Design a protein around this ligand. Structure first.
Ligand SMILES: Nc1ncnc2c1ncn2[C@@H]1O[C@H](COP(=O)(O)OP(=O)(O)O)[C@@H](O)[C@H]1O
Ligand SMILES: Nc1ncnc2c1ncn2[C@@H]1O[C@H](COP(=O)(O)OP(=O)(O)O)[C@@H](O)[C@H]1O
Ligand SMILES: Nc1ncnc2c1ncn2[C@@H]1O[C@H](COP(=O)(O)OP(=O)(O)O)[C@@H](O)[C@H]1O
Ligand SMILES: [Mg+2]
Ligand SMILES: [Mg+2]
Ligand SMILES: [Mg+2]
Lengths: 538, 548, 541
């Protein structure tokens, strides 16, 4: 039908479209199968430029390696979109769609329709949402348990990096997250927590700074390096020259009038500097002990830097949009734009301001605040890929622990959620459900597909995956009759079951919810498609 | 049968992308890929090390015996080898000392790991083995330390510091090269004894200007600095004592033109007559306030006009060009002047002090000198380095950067904390780490054992490059550390090391009287970054590339 | 999302193999594609049909309005068409009549079955439907016979036989060509009071000698044959001897040489002198015996030597080569002699009789005519065709081959009874099958009805070539069958065809029973194969 219409085209239908979606799914699954879990293998990505970037995140692997298949680009958007808002569960979405297609394809070969199979996944998904309410556990945030946040931070950090980096980088996240909770209980991740690159001694020397760190310092030598008590000032006004909207020549007639008009360039700048001097006169007391610093969002003229250097005022220019939205949280002051209306109330407070330089670059450190509402995480590293590995680790770790404070619940992991849904879907009475007909295998297909995830953790350790679930099955058979509510786990060190409640392995709530919802939608849409084709003008 | 299916489901990725897993002996190949350029480093560590020719696509050649420098120009395909390039680049930037060692160790740790992975040790246990060895290695470096400097400025103490550093890069003669650095270090340091002030030192203070011709013995130590400039108006020997004054201006010595459309406007002939003379009288009037302060040389930051030049050389004011930012900032540190962009009167407190400004022929071209005297000392001194081949000037200049980088190692920590060199610091850790393997149980003992075997490359390399048979020189040195109960209590068997030239057998007559030592701060970060180089290469089990 | 994964069964069968299975749409692709060649045989159908010029790769041009001659030369890449090609060739080699009906029916069964497959009826049931409908068609044709012939000897009785066949191909020539074919069959058949027990007849009895030039009316019948050959030696007497004994030798007239090669050996000059006369006296001993019995004509298949030709010239014996072996035995059937590879001597029992042999030019070229009067002949005849172009005479030969092939189709079986033609029995079968479909309830009733609709093309194809409206004469013809007289209703082809009714007996248009039965069977078997296949596997080039 397509060859007589289009003189050139490609068409697959009714057996190859199903084999393509399953073969491409099994192919992409094998790539990210080994990365899943704590003992998984690392993966570097080097392009033709020659740069190196190292991480285990499936999003970085998918959004850097170009892919030609039409199925995998939907898995790429699904794995990326789930991680872009949640920050965790990337490879879990690929494994579910990677496993649910092959687990249903065996029954498509038997002759079951794709429509009624996907109808079983949807009604089975509603059972999992009802199971999340009973499976989760309530946790009160008023206790302010720091040990509970430490265990959540080690869940994601142990997966990416080893124990040496996890132990030193875990309390860096906990100290940053401990300040997030407040009376308003409004979560703020992007403005409050930041990441900055700095090539320094080693990755292990990452330290926590309570104040806002800046990537610039004092240009002039005579300007002060260290300041004990520095009251900041925010000004978004540009203090260099301005070209003035079509204004043209300073038509000068005589030679004396030439430089007389050139001196007017300083008058516009000096009109704004005098307001700073008038502000300094109000806070002139204890001038050797105290200090003053000005932070500008736009550039400052080098002619005006000597004015600040004479009065021992520290100058910082060309700040980011985000840093201006963070000085009020750290120093406690208020922002200002125009130099007309000033007051001492808007000035912040800082207990220690010092600068340290390496090579050509220079960094400014601010800390020792009275009541800092925000902070930073200055990560140290050796190579560029070391920063990229710490970028993805801190980016995925902050989002995972931040979601625990959003809600009042937390899901235990280590296969407890998948193993619990297996017994629930395989033992629940079907008469309570509304599905009938050939929906018998759809419940078994999706229930059995969840088992492949916790044994993929075992496949990286090298043990037999089927044998380490024998005692797990025998434990739950007696746990229901023993009248003791416990949740089992999968410990890869010894190859035996464990309890995530005491070991500290946990997982966020919206990760597993959005993962199955996004995976079931993608896997269902790929099953119903029975024809592939390419056509268009080019 | 005639053709395979050629890897089905390969259209998931592009045709140019390739995967490289741990299987198929590819981790052995990555160790072999390190072994290609690692053997190039064997001929380049030590005082008998051989330099390397590197011809770039542009044709710029650099001759060198260091690693961090040679690896910058070579375009590398293997990513695991690039870890060593950036690891040595980190070594050069931070400490500026001990890069051949990083490569040599991070390469031999991968060499002995070739035996461990072949035996069947898991990669996770290998990282735990070297980390536990690293904590014991850095601990024992602080224990077996002997000696300290305790004085920032001394003639004899600096010979113990600079001489073992520059002995690797362009050894040559010892005294003529060491005295140029020890004399220049004393000039720039703020001594200030019995004051309690914090010391301070900058790597950018000491800078070497390359001048062709002459010989290495004719090199002198200049108090000030030098450029290859020409005075515009006139040259002056300046035989007048009673020191001159210095005024630095960052703006050009000309009329400050309007930034927005500076154009003449003359409505009548009365303005036409006075406009030509007005510029002359205006420029002259600005020079009166400058000339009355007693200044005789002004350093300009950009192009100077001819009318301003006519009034400067009238009173004999020298003009100097510095058309860049850093070239103008380095000169203010010598005389201690504070520049101001205005064309007004320099402040008397801000005027600099320079006694003489000579112009002589060194390399056939015109150069201007700013030698100070013993009174009113200055900082940011230079070293006139004379040589025949421009390629040798480049490597000797970076040897001063390594020596100046070694002086930085004294400021931050509490003191010097020197160690015995000539392989003595490496061979001592072999016995201590070997004993540590016997104390710990578990399957990690083989990782601790092979970590000690990797440290044999420093004495094995120095014995191979010295033209001696390593099979006889190495076990002869082990007898000094295998020994017990010998007379003296105050034991002096720690200073035994290899020898490049001389007596047979080789245990050197101590590294003592020889006055060669190593820095603690270099060994700390070198073993740290070398272990990180082996950690990142051994921890990864799959590699993915593109386009090749 | 740029390059596909390329169908990962590409490790299986090579790129040259193409699969065109069903569900994908094979049936829709095939039934349609073949509608182009279906219109070729449809336009070339009937007495007013259009002949089609087919130029093969060698360049030999042919112009024939049949179907077997056309499709033999057409290099057709489509495999489903080729089932119809050699199925039509089976009709050519066996019966020699009904190529076009086969094409307009085998293809129409596939065209009319579009409704069955599109509605969703099972393909297996359609094969069972046409098979049971085929059995009812064969049983029902016997009852509609009114032409039970038992004489099959006289010439006027063949006017109901040969003239409908000749009227199809080049309708303008009926009486002339029928006189040639009918007079040829009378010479072929022997004179006897009652010849029975299935007398033998073959297509090689009546041959066709094509002569360039001359109008078709100037043709004539020759009992012998005519060869484009040059006689040698003398001119004939043409009335003097009154009869001529003709010996046919397979081997040439020469000294008997062995298969193994030899040469002349002479030990002395005495044998050299006698060798010149020895060869002359050797043939003279064998040639003089032939002339004693009066053999006035010798035919040697291989090349005749000059020494043998010289002795025959003085006695006045006719010589002839006849190099081809197939046409050598046909001359023996005329005279009534046997081949003789041995030289031997002529015997009276093995030697035949020939009245006269005369030489002239018919179309400018000198030829040898073996016409004889008052002689006994057995299974031999020829038709001398005169025409303006060689391209037209080629179609007259195949028309005569189809005419005499019908004589083979009559006399070989026990009965070759007639049927009403001109769109008379085809519309009757539509009424019979329409009533048969209601007798058997079931899902196969739809196949029985659509099998009857496929027979509609036979009347309207005569109307389409006649420039008449199909929607007027075809439904008007059904009203004539309402009710013997209703059986002899047919399609008229004339300017007065507005009524659409013409009696069959006025012009005596008839068709054969065995020809239509074999055509319906091969047509149903052709449609059975095309509807039974689902997958078609090609290959490279
Ligand atoms: N140390 C551990 N012990 C047991 N299970 C773990 C451990 N670390 C991670 N997991 C499990 O691995 C799964 C994936 O973790 P994570 O890397 O955060 O998500 P993703 O692999 O989708 O990016 C989680 O379900 C978690 O329970
Ligand atoms: N003359 C000498 N005798 C014995 N040992 C020496 C001598 N010169 C250098 N060495 C040893 O050779 C080693 C070479 O160190 P190397 O890595 O080349 O230093 P650098 O970092 O300056 O390149 C030193 O650690 C030192 O102990
Ligand atoms: N003068 C005529 N009047 C009516 N019908 C005619 C006339 N001449 C020929 N026909 C019809 O034209 C048809 C041509 O059939 P044809 O395809 O030649 O038969 P076959 O397929 O057996 O070779 C015949 O069935 C015959 O009935
Ligand atoms: Mg994760
Ligand atoms: Mg050194
Ligand atoms: Mg016919």
């Amino acid at each position: 039908s397509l060859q007589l219409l289009n003189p050139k085209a490609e068409s697959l239908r009714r057996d190859a479209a199903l084999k393509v979606n399953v073969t491409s799914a099994e192919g992409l699954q094998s790539v990210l199968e080994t990365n899943l879990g704590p003992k998984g293998t690392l993966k570097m990505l080097v392009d033709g430029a020659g740069n190196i970037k190292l991480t285990k995140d499936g999003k970085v692997l998918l959004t850097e390696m170009q892919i030609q298949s039409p199925t995998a680009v939907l898995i790429a958007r699904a794995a990326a979109a789930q991680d872009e808002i949640t920050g965790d569960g990337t490879t879990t979405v690929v494994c579910l769609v990677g496993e649910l297609l092959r687990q249903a394809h065996r029954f498509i070969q038997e002759g079951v329709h794709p429509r009624i199979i996907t109808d079983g996944f949807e009604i089975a998904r509603k059972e999992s949402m009802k199971f999340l309410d009973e499976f989760k556990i309530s946790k009160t945030n008023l206790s302010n348990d720091r040990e509970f946040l430490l265990q959540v931070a080690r869940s994601s950090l142990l997966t990416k990096v080893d124990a040496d980096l996890t132990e030193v980088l875990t309390p860096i996240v906990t100290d940053a997250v401990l300040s997030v909770y407040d009376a308003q209980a409004d979560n703020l991740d992007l403005h409050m927590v930041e990441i900055m690159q700095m090539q320094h001694l080693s990755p292990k020397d990452t330290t926590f700074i309570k104040g806002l760190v800046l990537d610039h310092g004092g240009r002039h030598p005579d300007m002060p390096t260290r300041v004990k008590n520095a009251y900041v000032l925010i000004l978004n006004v540009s203090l260099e020259y301005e070209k003035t909207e079509v204004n043209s020549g300073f038509f000068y007639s005589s030679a004396d009038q030439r430089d007389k008009l050139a001196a007017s360039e300083r008058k516009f700048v000096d009109a704004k500097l005098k307001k700073i001097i008038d502000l300094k006169n109000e806070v002139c007391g204890m001038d050797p002990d105290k200090g003053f610093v000005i932070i500008n969002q736009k550039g400052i003229d080098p002619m005006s830097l000597d004015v600040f250097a004479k009065h021992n005022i520290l100058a910082l220019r060309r700040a980011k949009r985000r840093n201006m939205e963070r000085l009020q949280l750290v120093t406690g002051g208020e922002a200002q734009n125009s130099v007309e209306d000033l007051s001492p109330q808007i000035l912040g407070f800082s207990g220690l301001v010092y600068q340290e330089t390496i090579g050509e670059e220079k960094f400014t450190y601010v800390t020792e605040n009275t009541d800092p509402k925000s902070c930073t995480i200055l990560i140290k590293g050796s190579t560029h890929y070391a920063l990229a590995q710490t970028k993805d680790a801190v980016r995925d770790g902050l989002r995972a622990v931040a979601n625990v404070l959003k809600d009042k619940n937390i899901i235990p992991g280590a296969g407890a959620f998948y193993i619990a849904l297996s017994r629930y879907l395989r033992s629940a009475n079907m008469n309570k459900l509304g599905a009938k007909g050939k929906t018998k295998t759809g419940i078994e297909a999706f229930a059995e597909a969840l088992l492949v995830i916790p044994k993929t953790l075992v496949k990286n350790s090298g043990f037999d995956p089927l044998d380490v679930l024998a005692m797990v099955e025998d434990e739950l058979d007696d746990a229901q009759d023993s009248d003791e509510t416990r949740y089992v786990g999968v410990d890869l060190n010894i190859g035996d079951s464990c309890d995530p409640t005491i070991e500290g392995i946990w997982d966020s709530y919206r990760v597993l919810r959005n993962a199955i919802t996004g995976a079931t939608g993608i896997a269902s849409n790929l099953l119903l498609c029975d024809e592939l084709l390419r056509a268009g003008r080019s | 049968s005639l053709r395979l299916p050629q890897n089905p489901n390969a259209g998931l990725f592009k045709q140019g992308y390739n995967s490289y897993s741990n299987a198929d002996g590819q981790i052995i190949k990555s160790i072999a890929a390190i072994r290609e350029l690692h053997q190039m480093c064997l001929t380049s560590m030590g005082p008998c090390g051989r330099n390397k020719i590197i011809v770039n696509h542009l044709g710029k050649i650099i001759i060198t015996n260091d690693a961090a420098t040679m690896l910058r120009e070579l375009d590398i395909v293997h990513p695991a080898v690039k870890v060593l390039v950036m690891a040595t680049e980190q070594q050069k930037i931070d400490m500026g000392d001990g890069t051949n060692l990083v490569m040599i160790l991070a390469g031999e740790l991968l060499n002995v790991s070739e035996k461990l992975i072949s035996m069947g040790l898991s990669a996770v246990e290998i990282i735990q083995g070297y980390n536990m060895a690293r904590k014991f290695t850095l601990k024992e470096l602080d224990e077996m330390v002997v000696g300290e400097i305790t004085d920032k400025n001394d003639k004899n103490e600096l010979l113990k510091m600079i001489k073992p550093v520059i002995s690797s890069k362009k050894y040559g003669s010892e005294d003529i090269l060491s005295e140029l650095v020890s004399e220049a270090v004393s000039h720039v340091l703020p001594v200030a004894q019995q004051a309690g002030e914090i010391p301070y030192f900058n790597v950018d203070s000491i800078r070497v200007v390359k001048i062709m011709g002459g010989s290495l013995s004719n090199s002198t130590v200049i108090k000030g600095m030098v450029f290859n400039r020409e005075p515009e108006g006139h040259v002056k020997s300046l035989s007048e004592d009673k020191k001159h004054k210095v005024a630095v201006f960052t703006c050009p010595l000309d009329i400050a033109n309007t930034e927005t459309k500076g154009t003449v406007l003359l409505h009548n002939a009365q303005e036409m007559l006075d406009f030509s003379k007005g510029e002359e009288k205006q420029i002259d009037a600005m020079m009166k306030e400058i000339a009355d302060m007693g200044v005789e040389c002004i350093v300009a930051g950009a192009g100077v006009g001819e009318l301003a030049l006519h009034y400067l050389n009238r009173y004999g004011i020298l003009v100097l060009k510095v058309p860049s930012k850093f070239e103008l900032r380095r000169l203010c540190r010598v005389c201690g002047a504070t520049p101001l962009p205005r064309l007004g009167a320099p402040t008397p407190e801000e005027l600099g002090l320079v006694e003489t400004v000579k112009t002589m022929e060194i390399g056939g071209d015109r150069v201007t000198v700013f030698k100070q005297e013993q009174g009113e000392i200055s900082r940011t001194s230079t070293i006139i380095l004379r040589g025949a081949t421009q390629n040798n000037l480049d490597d000797i200049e970076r040897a001063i950067d390594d020596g100046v980088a070694a002086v930085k190692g004294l400021m931050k920590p509490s003191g010097g904390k020197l160690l015995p060199g000539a392989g003595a610091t490496e061979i001592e850790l072999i016995s201590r780490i070997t004993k540590y393997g016997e104390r710990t149980p578990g399957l990690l003992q083989l990782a601790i054992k092979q970590f000690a075997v990797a440290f044999e490359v420093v004495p094995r390399t120095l014995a191979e490059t010295a033209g001696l048979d390593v099979n006889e020189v190495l076990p002869n040195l082990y007898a000094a550390h295998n020994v017990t109960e010998p007379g003296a209590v105050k034991t002096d068997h720690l200073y035994k090391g290899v020898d490049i030239d001389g007596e047979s057998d080789e245990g050197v007559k101590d590294i003592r009287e020889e006055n060669i030592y190593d820095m603690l701060a270099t060994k700390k970060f070198a073993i740290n970054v070398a272990t990180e180089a082996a950690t990142t290469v051994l921890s990864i089990d799959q590699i993915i590339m593109a386009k090749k």
